[PDB]
């Protein structure tokens, strides 16, 4: 099973200039909980937007995707191609937005965080993937987080 898992404005932006314009404290604790113990397949991009105390994430395996035949993640693993980096009963692809849909063939799981943030569109972001018609959603309450801005957590699930 490969799953995906992003926090995303109510617009479908995930990140601007490298990094995520927003921080809910609640959404990295359902991040870490989905993902513990599992395999993580990041890009090179998300891997780098990682600092060096918290790379590689604990618990997990991470597996950086690059085109660079020589770069190095120190507590990484770097496969060149996304089917080399799924090896577990449980994969998770957690960005960013050029990886989302890259995984999205190989994806049954979409645990999708919507944080009701005003953010406009714009060039360069990093969006979440288009979800096609073959995918059935649940639909969370809407919640309350402490960095003020209110979220809802999705879970699409397709055979
Ligand atoms: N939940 C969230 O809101 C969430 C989750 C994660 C990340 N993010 C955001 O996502 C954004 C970054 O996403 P991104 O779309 O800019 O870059 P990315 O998807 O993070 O990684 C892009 C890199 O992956 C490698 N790559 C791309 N296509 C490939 C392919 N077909 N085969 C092999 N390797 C390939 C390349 O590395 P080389 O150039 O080294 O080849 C490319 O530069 C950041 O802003 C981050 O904050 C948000
Ligand atoms: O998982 C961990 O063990 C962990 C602990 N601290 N941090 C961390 C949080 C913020 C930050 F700026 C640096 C590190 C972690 O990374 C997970 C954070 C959840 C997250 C939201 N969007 C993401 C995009 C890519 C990768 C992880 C995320
Ligand atoms: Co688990």
């Not at 490969?2 to 995303?8: H, K, P």
Request: aromatic residues 8%.
């Amino acid at each position: 099973m490969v799953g995906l898992i992003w926090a995303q404005a109510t617009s479908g932006v995930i990140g601007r200039g490298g990094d995520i314009p927003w921080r809910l404290p609640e959404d990295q604790a359902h991040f870490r909980e989905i993902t513990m113990g599992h395999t993580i397949v990041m890009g090179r991009r998300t891997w780098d937007s990682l600092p060096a105390k918290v790379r590689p994430l604990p618990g997990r395996r991470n597996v950086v995707l690059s085109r660079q035949a020589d770069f190095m993640a120190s507590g990484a693993e770097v496969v060149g191609s996304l089917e080399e980096a799924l090896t577990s009963p449980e994969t998770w692809v957690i960005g960013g937005g050029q990886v989302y849909a890259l995984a999205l063939p190989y994806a049954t799981r979409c645990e999708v965080t919507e944080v009701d943030i005003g953010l406009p569109r714009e060039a360069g972001d990093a969006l979440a993937p288009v979800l096609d018609e073959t995918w059935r959603g649940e639909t969370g309450e809407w919640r309350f987080s402490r960095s003020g801005l209110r979220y809802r957590l999705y879970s699409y699930h397709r055979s």
